[PDB]
Design an enzyme around this catalytic site. Sequence first.
Site, short mmCIF file in Angstrom:
data_model
loop_
_atom_site.label_atom_id
_atom_site.label_comp_id
_atom_site.label_asym_id
_atom_site.label_seq_id
_atom_site.Cartn_x
_atom_site.Cartn_y
_atom_site.Cartn_z
N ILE A 79 0.99 -1.19 0.09
CA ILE A 79 -0.14 0.36 -0.27
C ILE A 79 0.71 1.17 -0.12
CG2 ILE A 79 -1.95 -1.54 1.20
CD1 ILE A 79 -1.69 -0.23 3.96
N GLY A 80 2.08 1.38 1.19
CA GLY A 80 3.47 2.37 0.22
C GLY A 80 4.61 1.89 0.10
N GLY A 81 5.01 2.61 -0.34
CA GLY A 81 6.48 2.64 -0.79
C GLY A 81 6.98 3.21 -0.29
N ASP A 138 7.30 16.14 9.33
CA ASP A 138 7.03 15.52 8.26
C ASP A 138 5.18 16.18 8.05
OD1 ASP A 138 6.55 15.56 4.77
OD2 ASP A 138 7.01 14.50 4.81
N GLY A 173 12.02 5.98 -0.58
CA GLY A 173 12.85 5.81 -0.31
C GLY A 173 13.11 4.48 1.10
N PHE A 174 12.83 4.89 2.16
CA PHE A 174 13.05 4.05 3.88
C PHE A 174 12.10 3.14 4.03
CE2 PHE A 174 16.01 7.94 3.93
CZ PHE A 174 16.42 8.92 2.95
N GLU A 199 8.94 -0.34 3.43
CA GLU A 199 7.30 -0.07 1.90
C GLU A 199 6.27 -0.58 3.46
OE1 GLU A 199 8.34 -3.81 -0.38
OE2 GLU A 199 9.88 -2.35 -1.90
N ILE A 200 4.91 -0.20 3.42
CA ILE A 200 4.08 -0.02 3.99
C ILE A 200 3.10 -1.40 2.90
CG2 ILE A 200 2.32 0.71 5.34
CD1 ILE A 200 4.85 2.70 4.20
C1 LIG Z 1 -2.73 3.47 11.60
C2 LIG Z 1 -1.33 3.65 10.66
C3 LIG Z 1 -1.76 3.75 9.31
O1 LIG Z 1 -3.10 3.70 8.64
N1 LIG Z 1 -1.05 4.27 7.97
C4 LIG Z 1 0.13 3.38 8.05
C5 LIG Z 1 0.06 2.01 8.51
C6 LIG Z 1 1.34 1.79 8.46
C7 LIG Z 1 2.82 1.99 7.98
C8 LIG Z 1 2.69 3.49 7.89
C9 LIG Z 1 1.67 3.98 7.75
C10 LIG Z 1 2.60 5.51 7.26
C11 LIG Z 1 3.60 5.41 7.74
N2 LIG Z 1 4.75 6.09 7.32
C12 LIG Z 1 4.27 6.91 6.29
N3 LIG Z 1 5.21 8.23 5.59
C13 LIG Z 1 4.55 8.29 5.27
C14 LIG Z 1 3.44 8.28 4.52
C15 LIG Z 1 2.99 6.92 5.93
C16 LIG Z 1 2.19 5.80 6.24
#
Ligand SMILES: *CCC(=O)Nc1ccccc1-c1cnc2[nH]ccc2c1
Length: 293
Positions: free
Chosen positions: A20-22, A134, A24-25, A27-28
């Site tokens: 769902i996310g990527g 940020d 530089g540092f 992946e999510i």
């Molecule tokens: C409870 C968290 C959520 O819904 N979103 C999330 C979930 C898991 C991992 C990451 C994030 C998150 C973390 N850092 C980020 N930097 C930019 C965008 C995000 C999203």
Amino acid sequence: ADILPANYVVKDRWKVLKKIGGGGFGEIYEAMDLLTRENVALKVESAQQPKQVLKMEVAVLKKLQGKDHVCRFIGCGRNEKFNYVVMQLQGRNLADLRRSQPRGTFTLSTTLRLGKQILESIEAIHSVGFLHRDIKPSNFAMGRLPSTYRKCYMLDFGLARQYTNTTGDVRPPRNVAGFRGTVRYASVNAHKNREMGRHDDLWSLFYMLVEFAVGQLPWRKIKDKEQVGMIKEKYEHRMLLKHMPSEFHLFLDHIASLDYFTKPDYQLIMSVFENSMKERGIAENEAFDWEKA
Ligand SMILES: *CCC(=O)Nc1ccccc1-c1cnc2[nH]ccc2c1
């Protein structure tokens, strides 16, 4: 170049569903919890990756258990391919909801209410000795639960930095410290590559709201970090508040009058919101723009 493929299982409990996310540092990922059957946000960092950031993410997340506007911490762990953190999954982020709006603008109702909830999570993190640095729409989201769906949350502590020490004194500022974030909501402090304060997380907040109400910022089109600064360095900030409540001439005066050291008056800024809400018959039990009520 995906750290985990689908249907991978971390620690016999978290079956990866999708990326769902990527970035530089890290992946999510969305994962099904196989123990408790709920889904969950699994963030991951390569074991070899130079900038071991996740761990510091998990410290902030742990100090903030207890607070509202913070995902529940599920688990963390490391092995010889990737370090991982497990936490609660949340709903649509603010950037995405803002774009969904016909005019790309929230009402003043929804803005002022968001305002109040974002400011808490900022104070919250300041309280445990960290800057977010940020602050942006896309870094906040809404719940996805009966118990949370009208709750706005804080995401990412990637770029976070501690400003205190073990006790509770203010760490000395660097003579330089190179902005490493998102331009649109960056203070002029950050543009000048000066060490960021709690006030700089509040500049970010200021500009976020202006864009939620008005629907655009002067520089929104530019992507040159240096240009933007020069514009923001020259711009009259009262010009933004021309279509914004008159309580935001205080918020602006207050933050323009802060440095690294000086602690912000969180209550003041929480009033600018609650007063403006009042001089407008706006209730907390009001719906949000995206709600179909
Ligand atoms: C409870 C968290 C959520 O819904 N979103 C999330 C979930 C898991 C991992 C990451 C994030 C998150 C973390 N850092 C980020 N930097 C930019 C965008 C995000 C999203």
